[PDB]
Structure formats: structure tokens, C-alpha cells
Amino acid sequence: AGYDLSVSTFSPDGRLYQVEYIYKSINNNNTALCLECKDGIICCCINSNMDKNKMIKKNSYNRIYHVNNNIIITYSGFDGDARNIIDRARSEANTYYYNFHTNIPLHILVNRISLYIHAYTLYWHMRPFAASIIISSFNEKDKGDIYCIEPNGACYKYSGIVIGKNKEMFKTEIEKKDYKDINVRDAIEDIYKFILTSDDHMNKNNLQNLVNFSWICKESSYEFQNIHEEILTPALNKAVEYIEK
Amino acid sequence: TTICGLVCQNAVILGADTRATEGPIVADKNCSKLHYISKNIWCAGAGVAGDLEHTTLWLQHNVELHRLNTNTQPRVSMCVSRLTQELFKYQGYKVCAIVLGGVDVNGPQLYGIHPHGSSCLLPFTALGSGSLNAMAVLEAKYRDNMTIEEGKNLVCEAICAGIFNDLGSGGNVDICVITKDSYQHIRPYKEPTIYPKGTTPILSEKIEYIK
Amino acid sequence: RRYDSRTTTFSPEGRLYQVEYALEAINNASITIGLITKDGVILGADKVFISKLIDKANNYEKIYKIDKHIFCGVAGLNADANILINQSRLYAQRYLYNYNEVQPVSQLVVQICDIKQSYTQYGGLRPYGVSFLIGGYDTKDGYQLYHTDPSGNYSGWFATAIGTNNLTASSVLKQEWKNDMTLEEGLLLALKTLAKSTDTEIPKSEKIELAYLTNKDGEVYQKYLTEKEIEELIKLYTQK
Amino acid sequence: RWYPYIDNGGTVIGLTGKDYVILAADTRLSLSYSIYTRFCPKISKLTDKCIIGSSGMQSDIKTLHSLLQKKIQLFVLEHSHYPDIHVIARLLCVILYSRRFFPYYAFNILAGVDENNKGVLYNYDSVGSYCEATHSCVGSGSQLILPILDNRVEQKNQLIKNTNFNLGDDINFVKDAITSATERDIYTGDKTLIYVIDKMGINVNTLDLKQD
Amino acid sequence: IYNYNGGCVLGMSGSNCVAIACDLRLGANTFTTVSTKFSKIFKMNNNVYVGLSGLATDIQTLYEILRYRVNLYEVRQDAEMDVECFANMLSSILYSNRFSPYFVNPIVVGFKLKHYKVNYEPYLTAYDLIGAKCETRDFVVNGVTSEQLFGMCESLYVKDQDENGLFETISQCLLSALDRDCISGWGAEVLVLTPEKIIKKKLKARMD
Amino acid sequence: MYDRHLTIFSPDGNLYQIEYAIKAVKNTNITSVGVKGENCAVIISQKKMATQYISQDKLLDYNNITNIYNITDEIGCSMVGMPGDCLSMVYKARSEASEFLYSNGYNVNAETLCRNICDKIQVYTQHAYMRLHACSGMIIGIDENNKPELFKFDPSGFCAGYRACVIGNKEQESISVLERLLEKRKKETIDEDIRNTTILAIEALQTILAFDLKASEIEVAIVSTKNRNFTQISEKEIDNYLTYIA
Amino acid sequence: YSFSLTTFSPTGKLVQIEYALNRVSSSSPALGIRAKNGVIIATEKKSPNELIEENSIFKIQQISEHIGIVYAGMPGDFRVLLKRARKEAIRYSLQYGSEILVKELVKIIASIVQEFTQTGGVRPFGLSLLICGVDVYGYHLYQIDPSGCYFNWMATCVGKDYQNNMSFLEKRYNKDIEIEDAIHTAILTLKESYEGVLNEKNIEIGVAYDNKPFKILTQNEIKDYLI
Amino acid sequence: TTIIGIIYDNGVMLACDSRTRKINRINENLYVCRSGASAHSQKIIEIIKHYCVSMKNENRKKGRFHENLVTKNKYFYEDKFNDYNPLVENVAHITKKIIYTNNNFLSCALIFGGYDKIKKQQLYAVNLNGSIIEKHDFAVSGSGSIYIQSYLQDKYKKFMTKKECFNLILNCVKYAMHNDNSSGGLIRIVNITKSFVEEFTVVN
Amino acid sequence: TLGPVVTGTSVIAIKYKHGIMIAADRKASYGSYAKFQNVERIFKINNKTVMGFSGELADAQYLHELLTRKNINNLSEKKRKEDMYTPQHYHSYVSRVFYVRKNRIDPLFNNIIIAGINSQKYDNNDDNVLLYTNEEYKEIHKDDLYIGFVDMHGTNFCDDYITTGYARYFALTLLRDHYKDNMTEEEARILINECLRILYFRDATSSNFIQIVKVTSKGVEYEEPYILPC
Prior knowledge:
The structure is cut from a larger assembly and holds 9 protein chains of 9 kinds.
Chain A: H1 17-27, E1 31-36, E2 41-46, E3 64-67, E4 71-77, H2 79-100, H3 106-118, E5 131-137, E6 145-149, E7 155-158, E8 160-163, H4 167-174, H5 187-198, E9 211-216, E10 225-226, H6 229-244
Antiparallel strand pairs in A: 1-2, 1-8, 2-9, 3-4, 4-5, 5-6, 6-7, 9-10
Chain D: E1 11-16, E2 21-25, E3 29-30, E4 35-37, E5 43-47, E6 50-56, H1 58-79, H2 85-98, E7 106-113, E8 119-124, E9 130-133, E10 135-139, H3 142-153, H4 167-184, E11 191-197, E12 202-208
Antiparallel strand pairs in D: 1-2, 1-10, 2-11, 3-4, 5-6, 6-7, 7-8, 8-9, 11-12
Helix pairs in contact in D: 3-4
Chain H: E1 3-6, E2 12-16, E3 23-27, E4 30-36, H1 38-58, E5 72-76, H2 88-101, E6 108-116, E7 120-126, E8 132-134, E9 138-141, H3 145-155, H4 162-179, E10 187-192, E11 196-202
Antiparallel strand pairs in H: 1-2, 1-9, 2-10, 3-4, 4-6, 5-11, 6-7, 7-8, 10-11
InterPro entries (chain F): Ntn_hydrolases_N (IPR029055), Proteasome_alpha (IPR050115), Proteasome_alpha-type (IPR023332), Proteasome_asu_N (IPR000426), Proteasome_sua/b (IPR001353), Proteasome_subunit_alpha6 (IPR034642)
Protein name (chain F): Proteasome subunit alpha type-6, putative
GO biological process, one term (chain F): ubiquitin-dependent protein catabolic process
């Protein structure tokens, strides 16, 4: 009743509807998941909406970016807002390195990005960012860290997370077993099986041109690296063969 | 001008001369160097008189405002910070060397502030043209944990000698005693032909009564 | 944008609908009078009664002075009145600073009306709901009297009344005022008009305030009558 | 207490014919008394029928040539024709006068062929003033060679006179002048580039000079 | 810079009476007098006066600024300004331009009202070009003739005195001081201010 | 129309936005309790997710969740409300403390910090283009006189001192419990008082929430003259104290 | 984006100012009295539970060494106005080197309130200040309003049932009332308006004693006065 | 003015004279010695202390973790394991930046000593202008130190014990004071180790 | 900014088969004091790129910060190995920076050398970059190598060998007299050793503790410091 026309107005029940609408919009966009393993962490993104388009190059639409070559950052929402937030993260890292001659700790970067996102939800003229972001990292000593920031501006730490379409089914699959003891290389099979099962739009032919993959593990010397085809294809084929039976 | 400061048993003592000069001549024979900052903090400086007075008033009123807002006894460290920041902001072009004395929750303490903005806390010090003589006497006679009477006697010894030695300082001797509770300001502490009517000629006159 | 008030916007008939409401509010304030005589200018007014505990001494709520030769009276909101009085004093002293001479009244009224017009045209800020009666004296034109309003309109007058019941007071002024008059007769006429507009046969010494500006001995000065003086004045009026 | 001006030295020569222009330049970059490198061209191609040579601060001339090329490219993009030599000359004058109080340490010669097949040379100064001429020289060797070109072309103080001049003779004369400057000057250079602009495009040749 | 257009102002106190005197010279290029009417004393309030010495343009500008401020304060408060408030405001104004200041060294002279009846206490003070206020309670001098005025006042001051004696002393001191300065002099003006009245006079000074 | 869409008075003098922000703070249903004794002050809260669109998942590091921060080594804080609002408020408090230290040369006092934060909240309430930060909080510290001090602030910018206070739902029913416990206390070594205050806070939170308060589900911190730093007690000692209460 | 949220309505009346006045009319009452040799500002704070400390919340402040103030309305607005009043007094002292006159400070605060009523994007202050003081021109007691218009009073009351309190105060008041008698009358008026039982920690009082610093009476003094 | 710093095994030592307290405590495990202009040094010290407090507060994690006379004072580190204490490198580099951006006026030489978990004990030298160099053996600054340079070079060892470094630094400062005419007063020394910091003064 | 205080001596960079070789002494003199005798004066921007140094230390460090963060930004938005900036790119960038600073009259008291490989057809190192942590050499055509000079006043150029500082007189003479084309690593090292020995004998600011770096198909290699045989 007029309490949802601005992000700066509180509802009679004490609730910002303009942010719940952003949450609903995000929940309908492509789905992205990320989890941690012994060797490292794997981030996967599923661009199921673009299956209608038959003119996009194979694996050209990538939703996984990196900062400092050792921190994976991904999103699930509007492309423009996500790009803006990635550039802000890069700028924050640049200022940190200029000031202290050292890479920004992850738990500070997540806080800064959360503040930046939240700063856009308390004015009437600005439009709040419609995107949910995941930032993760891994090192041999401190093991993997995963954080998830959301439009409201809340950052929480996870041992595995999924956002977007069918997030509930994917999460149910992830907590099926403990992945803190599985290796990064053999987790790809389970990821592929989950994306095949939960999503009802992708099939055998869609798995090699719509899903983006990356990890930060010991094989990559704990630095960001997109998974190459020679590794992905065997696991994809094995997963589809297992499903078919 | 001679300014001296000393820290005595749970107290502070400041002393000064009462002579100001406009070159090789003396303008005022009973000037007042000691300035009231708060009920437990005082200052006394040398340099440009206008800069000294303006900065002292500014600091006093800002300290009073801060005390009212915070409802806490003023502290010498805050004043030191204020002077240092202000002077450093002006590149030292506002030449005013100050001795600041106070008794805050941390006990009595004396600071010396220099024109360029640097500060240093000391148990006793002196500034001005006669600073050398007064500080010589202080260092010769000064001791720790003195009595108020002994402190005042030494404060004279210093300022009084500076008066008798340096040409740029003279007149009476002002002194102030600062305690955690209450203070004292002894201004004159020590202090060491008519023409017939119509003589002058005039060529005009006009009387206007005031309403 | 959704909450905009539409302040500086012409009405379907070209009135802005805000100066109208401001003037309507003006019509509800206490009444103020203004006369010009052969000995000075008078700005007798009527005091609004709030309670019996207000300090009678001094406490002038209607008439103020902007300079030794200019003084006016208010018939609107008191806050806007005060800030406009401050602006008028600033303007008069700035003119004196620039030209080393006292400002003619026309210049000051022009400036204040210009600021009112600026507030009426630019931005989305509401207009000032105050109307003055600036009166004074200067060598160029002698005794003068004007009358402003929220629109920034001003006009000269020889005798006027503004505020509530301004119609009856103006009728009395037109019926009785003369081209030349002694200061005493001017004060008597102002008191009569104040009494008639108030619908009271005899004014109460505690309900009115009077003042006048005169160029006696080549030095213009203002006098604000105090309770005893107005008491003697009303005694004289009752006698006549 | 730092002076932001150093003369890198060098020489640029320009001559005009009925329907062609020749612009020669050294290829030496140097400091007060030592040489940075033996090859640093000073002639930058602006259009298909217009080139510019400069002498002075190497950084300044490089930046000026790049900026002028950008302006010309933008003009072509937004107007759909190549600017004429007169337009380029006026634009260069405006650019140079823009920095009237921090002027470029660059003396410029602008050579080209008008739309009517006329060789045009414009000689500038460090602050913006320019004037058309039939022959010019800039750099260290300016004072040295300018009298030679004056005698050859204008041919004053002479009674017999001889105005029969063709492309080959002009090229040979330019080579002789640059060789003389190299012999009698220290900042001149060691290898020179000769650009020839004619109705049918432009060409570039290279000549070897002394190395001292 | 002060030699250009030199000047001299003096002020002395007595018993329920004050006096302020000044020279009346306006010159150019130091050694050329242009006018003999430029008065260095400006009445600022019914019982407050300020004597300005130094560059004439700075004197006029400072006088105008002070008049503006004083008139504003008086109108706003609906009462006369106090000497202490005037002195403090003058010091603040002078310090406001510590860098690129007003090349004027003024003095303030007047009455301090002790309300209770009312009492009149003489009030005097002199300033530097930055506002180095210093109360003196006694003779106060300012201008290129500072040294001569100091000497004369030291030799002649008689503590509290009748207004006649005060006028004689101040006039003699000023006349003696001015006769020893070449760039200052050319007439003198003396105002004797008392609660009842003010007497302004011009002395028969050495107009040469 | 729009009488309550902005921080505008509306009829009968009611800024409804203030009440809606306070109710949003209440809806988070996170309880925090602060209690001061002598030379010691204890602040306790629950280690749980707030109430919003997102729900807690199995793969969530429960140690990371916390409702207590610290503005400075000596000055501690506890916020409750919208997560982003809480983060912004703690960052503003940190900034104010740092600027106060820079501009005054000595560490700020929790009272002044609460007053300044209340001033910012007042500025937010005054203007229209600023949304209200729905995050209430408590601050605890020790003053120059070596005594504890505990203060509370709400979205209305009304900072007030306390000797025992609660943020969250059922505050009205919890004031009685706090009063009863404090009265029982009124009827000791420098460290025994610390233990007494800690057990009092834990018991108060247990009574208000009315269940076990698993040691892994609560977080407690204390400032005292013995330490003077806002150090939060570890899980083992919290469990030991809870067992003692039983 | 900066437009006036307060606008004239048909017949004017500045509705927002009326709502601010309504807010003021519902807050805790506070009154003041001008006596022969002093001024008093008193107010009532609602009986606090055992968890509040009256030492942390203060409805009586002091702007200068001679000027006291009390309010009735929004605490945050009161705090900000108090800070700005202190700043204004400090700058006046810096310029003229003396204690700021009561009338001048009242003028500055009224101008600030008026500007806040006028400017765009803001809403009027929701309190009603009350300033008492002493200066060379005797004693003074002024009242500010949300509209920004000040009144010069001899004895006044603000807040809930302010009309009844004003009538009662007028019933028993004199121009030559002693300071102690004024304190007693203030206590009686507050007790009558309270509609309950009063005691220490339930009332607050401040007094300007002749040429003495403005003083906020402590708990024991008011307790003794209550008997 | 003489400033000397020596890295011995498991710790670091910093020593200074007293003529015009030149060692300032930026943090419980981070000290800095200043030489040159006094006002510039003091202002920069205050600024960097502000920055250090800011970073120390910022990098604090969320949840629970880790479940003559020789008058001397000892201070035990409050933050065991250096969970949030700022790295010495960050402090040194921010100071370097601050000096660089104002090198046209700022003229002061600083020596940073401290202990970190990442890189253990460290010693940095920030020279005139924005120049920062990490010294593994020792650092020297001020007019006096020039007289002892060679001496230090001769008597330094790779892995010295606490008493050896004590004596070496004390003798170095004493010789600097003896030769240099602008250095004097009692010697102040600070020892920063892995789990505490102890500051003492010698009046010889 | 206002004048050199702590300065480097000189650097020598020459291109040879298998890549480029750049040498510099490890010393920073504080006037005539020689305070620091172990300083890294040859930095690395990325694989196939390194930056020289002869001048004030603070400005060199600031420029190193700028260049390394530009490389970080380049990597952040990199998708193909052809996206990596070439030595020409960084050389032009530093030239622009120097020109702007000159126009502002606040130069960097440095003489920079930017040297690397501007071709990506020889190795696959840049397809998977590793900033933290770290076969046979491939002959490189001299056209694929790049060495660029940058002066205080912004003057810049490219050549087959570059030297700065006092090396511009001794080492430059030796190179011009003896430098050959496609010389093996041993010959290049011998020539560099002769040049640096000559500098050590007739240069007060020089020293014999030498750092030598090689940019080749295997990337950037920091050889262990060694003392000149003398």
C-alpha cells in the first residue's frame, strides 16, 4: 500500500519490500554453486536460461571472475550490477595493495563489498543492486573460506553454498555427503550429476557449452584457474553414463 | 619576557615577568603573561603577542566546550594535541612558544610547545629572552618532590634572576599555583609638574552636551 | 518527485496558489496601522493577548527598527518577520558601508521585496507569509510609508491599515485623515482607528503599542511609547 | 630548480617544386654532447599527401605529432574527408598556441601537396606563428643551410639567373645541402631520410652521412 | 610603510574624565603634506572612541568595518555597546587578517559603566597591527611618534587629575612630541570626554 | 497521504517511521543482555542467524556468526537489527572512536561515543532522503575513574545509561527479571565479582529465553579493571559456568 | 531533490508546525518562574524503573556559566539544539569576550528553528525550548516554539495540561516573589499536574542565584525542599 | 641524535640517546625510532598511530578461535598468536607512502622494529623521501651513528644472544655519544621478542 | 621529488639469442656514504617484462608499484594469452607518465629501462600465470625482443642495447665497439662482465656485487648474485 515503491520507506510490519523483490528476482536468475574440498575449492555456474540462444560461442559466457589471481568471485543476478561490484572489489584491492604492499585479507574485502552494496539501499534516488555474490579462497594453511553477500548487505561464511534457480535441490544434494574429505579432482562428477538432476533444462549436449567451472586448489598452486577440457570431458562423460543407466 | 614552569608535590607552578617591549622601548610595565585556560590548566608564552592571545582564547573556549559536551575534567594531553595540530597546520609561521601546566586525573604535568608544532613534557622549563638565566638557576637549584613554599621561592629565584640579568624582561613577577582542586593567581607577588590653566594656546572650541 | 509540493508553479489563472494562502494567513494576524503627519510617521499596532504573565516591560512584538531613520511593523508570522528584519538590517548597514551614507527607504524596500520575489520564483521553497509597513525619513524624499506583501509587491501610502479588519481601519483613515496634521493629532487618530478596528469603544493601555519617527533638530529619532505614555494618550482621547 | 627543456638537436630541410615537395631530415638523437641513438626519425606521416617534420625536445615533438594525428583521424571519422594542408596548418597553429605559456620546444615544418597539385610548405615557430614559403629549414642547421637555399631558389644578387629546375636537380641539391650541414655541424646526424611528395603518393629514401 | 602618511594619536585618563588627541596631517611619499584636516579619531559610540594611525586607506576601511559591526550589534541588542566588547571585537577583527593585515595600529578610549546609580571608569588600550591588546590604565600612545609621546607622558603624567589639568597635560605632551617629528604634526585636535559633556578643541600647533 | 512514508510528523505528532524501524529491530528476535557490577561489565548474546529471507543451512560456519563486536580495545559493543545496518553502525562507531583519539589524544569514552551515534541517528531522523538504520545496540566500557559504564541506544537516537538492560523481544517482561536478579545481588574480591556478574548475566539470559542456552549457541564478553580489554570468554568456560548454574 | 516539505495550506496554518506543537503538548511538562533575585526552571521525569539512572539522562543543561535550559519534546532534537546553542555561545564569547546575552542567544536559536521550518527536505523540530538566564540587564526567561517564535515570560509552563498548569501558576504568583517561594510554587505546580506521588528522582530543578553560577539542584537538596 | 637497531636471534633491539624519548610505541609489538625534524616526526608518528589503530580494529576476525642503573619494565602481549596485530610491513609501507606524498617538506628518517607471526622479527629503514629498505642485520640513523658504523660492522654476528646484543648496542650508543657532539643523555633501549616487550634505560 | 638523495649507479640491458640479459650492481649510495650494499634494482612487471633503474630510490619504488598494479589489473580482465600487455605497452605507459610529470614540473629523478619480449608465439607461460611461487631455450628473432629507454624529460627510444648512468660512456663504448648479433649466453655474460668491471674501476658509486637477470622463453630468471672476478 505504497510501502513498496521506495527502498527508503519502512513497512507497517517493519520490512523493506523493495529488497524482497530483489531477492525474488535473484532467485529466478541462473544458478551458481561453490564448495570446498581437501585440495581446494570448486565454483560452478549454470547458465540454463541461455539454452534458447543457439548463436553464442561455446563457453564464452563466463560468470566466474578472480581478484589477486587467488580469490574467486562469482555472482547470480544482473550482469551490469555484478560487473560494477567486481570493479569495486578490484579497486578496493588496488587501494589496499598501494597502502600496505600486501594482498587484502578476504574477510576485510567481503566486509567492504557488503558495505558498498548496503550503501545503495537507504536512499530513494539510487537503485539497489540486484545481485547475490560469492567470494571464496583457499590456502594450504588456513584451508578454504567461502562468504556470501546478498542485496540486503549481509555477509555469512559457509562450507558450501548455492544461489539462484533450484537452489534448494542443489543444496539438498550438496549436504548429501561430506565434501571436506573429497578431493577437488573427483568432485566434478558429483557436481555434474547434481546439475543434470536438479535442472530440468540441461541435457548431455548442454553440459559442455553452458556450465562454467573453476577451482582454486593445490594443482593450480592455490591460484585461480579455469578447468580445461581434458579434465572436464572425462568426468562429464562418466556422469552422463552413470545417469543413463 | 621570561616564562618559567615547575612541577611540585601534586601541584604545578608558573611564573612570569610583567614587561612588554615594542623594540628598544618598553610599552607596558605591568603586562600579564599568565593566561587562564581552565580551572586546572594554565599557559604562558613568548613570541608574537597577538598570536599568543588569540590562540590562548581559542584553546580556552574550545576546551570549555569540550568539557561541557563530555562532562569530564579537561586533560593536558588534549590541549597539547590541539596546539600541536594547530601550529603544524600553519607551518610554524605563527611564532608562539608556550609553557603549559596542568593537573589532570593523571597528576601534575608541564609541556613545552614550540612554534613549529613539536611538544615535549618536562619537569621544569623556561622560555623567552631571559630563558637561559632562569633555566640555569632552575637546574642549579631544582629538586624533585618539593614543597609549595619552596617551589614558589625557586620560581622567584628563576624569574627574579632573569629580570635582573636579561634586558628584554623586567617589571614585577606574576605567579600561579595549579592544584588538582582549586588554583591561585598572585599577580603582584614580589615587585622588586602641573601646568597653570590657560598655558596652552587654542584657536577653536565647541562644547556638545551628552543626552 | 512523488512528494513534490508544487510551490513555485503558476495556477490555472496565474496566481501560484501559495502567495494566496500566505496573504490569507496575513489577513488573520493582528491589525497594524500607519500614518504620515507634518511631524512624523506613526505605526501604531495591536498586541495579541496570549496570557496575563507576559513581561509588559519592553517586549515589543509588532514594531521594530531597521536603522536610526527606518522602522516598520509586522502583520504576519513572527519567525519570518524576525529573519526578514535581520536581512533588512544587514542590507541597510551594507549600503552604509558601501556608500558612506544612510540608505533611502525606497532602496531598502526594493531589496527586501526582491528577496521575497526570489523566494517566490526560484527553488521549491515556500514563500514568506509576512507583510510589513516600512516607514521612515530621508533627505531625498522626506517622510514616506510603504506596504509590502508575500508577492514582493510594494506601494506608497499616506495612511493605511493592514491585517485583520484592515477594511474598517482603512475606512476610518480615509474618512478622518488630513494632508497636514500634528504628531499629537496623528497619534489620536491612530488610537481611534485601533479602537474601532478592535471593536472596542475604549482601547486598553495594555492591548496596544505606539511609536513614531521624527526629524527633530536635524537628527532623526524614533520614540516607542511606554505604558504610562499610552495611558496619558488614552486619557486625552477619552477627554476629546 | 629543475629546467624542463633540453634541445635534442638535429636538422630538417624542406623545398618545393611546381607540383611536388621534398622534405629531408636527420636521424640522430643526442644529448648535451653525447648521442642516445643513431636512428630516431623526426618526420611523421600525417595523411597521404601531408607530412610534418620537427626539431627540438624529442618527447615534445613525438607527443605533438601523435596528438595531431589523433585530431586528423577524428576529423576524418566525423566528417568523411581528408583535411587539406591548409586545414592541418591552421589546426597545428591552434594546438601550438594552446600552450602559449608552456610552449612546446618544437620548431615545425609542414609539407604537402594541395588539392590542385601545388607543393606547399609551412614553417612555424615554437609558439604558433607560421608562414608559407617555398623553402625552409629548422633545427641546429637552420642558420647554416638557410643562406644556401636562399641563394639556390630565390637567386637574388645574381644577373644571369637560372630558373630551370626539375625533381632530380632538387633532390640532388637537398642531398648536397644536408651533407654540407653534416660536415659543418655537430648535431646534424649520420643517416638522413628524404621524403618526396608528388601527385602519385609519397616515397621515402635513405642516405648515409658521416659519423663523428 | 608607516612613514608614508605618518600620524600620531594619544589618550590619557583623569578623575571621572578622559582625553583623546590626534594630529591632523595627511601626506604622500612621506615628505609631502597633502591635507591638514585628516582626523585620526572617529567617534564610535556615545562613550567609546577609537583612534586610528597608519595608512589612510586602511584607516578608512577599518573605520567603516567597525561602524558596520557596531551598528549591527547595537540595533540587534537595542542597547549601547560596552568598551570591553568593542575592544575584544576590534582585536578579533585585526587578527582575522593576520596574513596580509591592515597596516594600522589603533587605540581605544572610553568609559566603562558600572551599574548598580552608575559609575564611570576610564578605559584605555593600544593595539599592534595584529591586535596585540594590552590594557594600560594610564597614558596610551600610538603612531610614528610613539617614542616621543612615551617620553613626554612619562615625564608629565600626574595620575588622576581634573579635566582642565588633563587637557593641559595632554595638549602639552602632544605638542612637544609632534615638534620633534618631521613626517607628523600639522595641527592637533583634543577631545575631553566626561559623563556630562564632551569638549572638542583644536590647538594652535606649529603648522609648519 | 504520505503522512508516514517519510520521517514527517503526521497528525497527532507521531513519526511512524521511528516505530516501524523499532519494530523491524524487534522482529529479528535476537536477545542481548548487558549487566554491570563493580569494576566489571558483562555483555551476552545468542550466536544465531537473524530472521530474514535466507535461513541457516547445514554448511554454515556457526562460529562465524556473532552479535557482539568491539569499537576499541577497551570499548565493546553489541548490535541487534538488520545485518547491513549493524555492520554500518559498527563501522561508524569505529570511525568515531578513531577520530576522537586522533583529535583529542586520549581514548574516547563510551558515553561520548553513544552520544555521537545518537546525534547521527538524529540527523537521519531529521531529513527525508535518509532511511532509518533499524539496529539497536549496547555499549560497555570503563571510564577514567576506574568504574564500569553501560549504555543503550535505539533507532530513535535515544541514548540512555543503564545498570541492567536487554535488547530484543520481550524487553518489557525482561525488565522484571533483571530487577529481581539485581535486587538479589544487592543483598567480594576483584575477581569473585567478575564471576558473580557473569553468572548473573547467564542466568538472566536463560530465564528470558527459557531454555538451555547451549554453550555453542551463546557468546559472552566482559570488561573489567583486571583486564580492561573487551575479551570474549571461550566456549569451555561458558559451559562450565552454565553447568554451575544448573 | 531539495523541496519544501512544509507548505502553506488553504488558510495557511502550516500544518506541520501544528503537528509539532501537538507532539510538544503530549510530552512531560516543564515550567519556569522569574523571581525577584533569581530564575527557576523545573521539570518532571517519569518515575524510572530500577534499571535507569537519573545521572545519565538530564533534562536540565547549562549553555553558559549563567544560562540554563529545559525542554519538552524529542530528546534527540533537544541534544542537537543544545550542542548548537553551546557553539553559538562559544563563538559569541570568542568575538566579544564575555558571557552571551540571553536575548541574543534566543534570537540565534529562533532563527535556526525558523530556517529548519523553511528549508526543503526537512521537518520541524518537535520540542519547545525554555531558556532562563542572568546578565547585566537583569534576569530573563524566554520560550522558543517549533514555529521559531520566542516569547518573553515572567512565569510559564509547557507540555501536558500546560493550560491548567499556567492557570494555577498565575493564581499564586507575584512580581516580588522570593527565590525560595518560587521554588516552592514550582514544586506545588508540578505536584498538582503530576496526578500521582512525587519524590526525589521524580523532579529536576535548576536555579540562577543572583550573581552566582547557574546551579542544578542535587537529589538531597530537592529531598530537603520537599518536606 | 643517534638511532640504532639490531636483529638478534628471537627478537630485536632498538636503542637511542636523549638530547634535543625518541622511541615511540606504535603498538604492543611495533616500535619506531625517529630522527631529524622534531615537528615533522611527531606529526607523522601521530598519523601512523591513527592508521595502525584503524587497521588493528579492521582486521579482527569474527568468531571464537584457538580453543649504572638498568631500570626495566616488562609488558606481555595481550594478543597471543598475533591474531589481529598489524603486520610490521604494512605499517612501514604506509609510513613510506605518507612520507613520499609530502617529501617536498617532510624530512625525517625512521627505523621500524617489531615482531610478526608471518615474518618473525623485522627491521625496516625509511630514509629521506619515500625510500624504504628492509635490513636483516642492523639499521643506523642520525648524526652520531656515522661514527660507530664501522665498529658495528666489525662486532656483529649472525646469531647473537640477548646479552651479546645488549652489550653491543649499549657500547655502540655510548661511543656515538662520546664522539658525536649533538647526542647525549641517558640511553633508552627496547627489546621486542616473540611474546613480550621489555623497555629499560641506562644512565651511564 | 625535490632532488636525489639515495641513488643507484647504472644498468646494462642487451638482447641476445634466447632473449634479453640485464645486469646491475646491488648498491644504493646515500651521497658519498654507501649505506646499503644489498638492494634489488631490477624489478619484474610480468613474464617477458622487466624494468631497469638508475636514479632516486623512492621514485623507482613508486613506479614499480604503479607498474605491478597495472599488470594485476591487466591479468584480472585477461581471457587469452594474447591479452597480456607487451613491453612496448609498458614503455609507452611510462613515457606518458614521465611526460605528464614533466609538464607538471615534478619529475622522477630516474632513467628507466623497460625490456622484454613482445611476441607470444614462442612459449605458453602466460596461458596460466602464477604471481606467487614459481627443457631447452628457444632462439628468438631480434625483432621479437624489445628494449626501451626513458629519460627524465620523457625522451624515449628503442635499440638493441641500452645503458644508463655512467654506463652510458664506458659500457656504451665497449658495446658499440664489440657488440655482435645472436651471441650465445656465455659471450653476452663475458661482455657484460667486462663493461661492469670497467665501471667498477672508474666509478665511485659502483660496486662488484652484481645482480643479473635473464628474460627468455622460460620467463624471468633471477640468477644468484655473484662478486665480479676482478
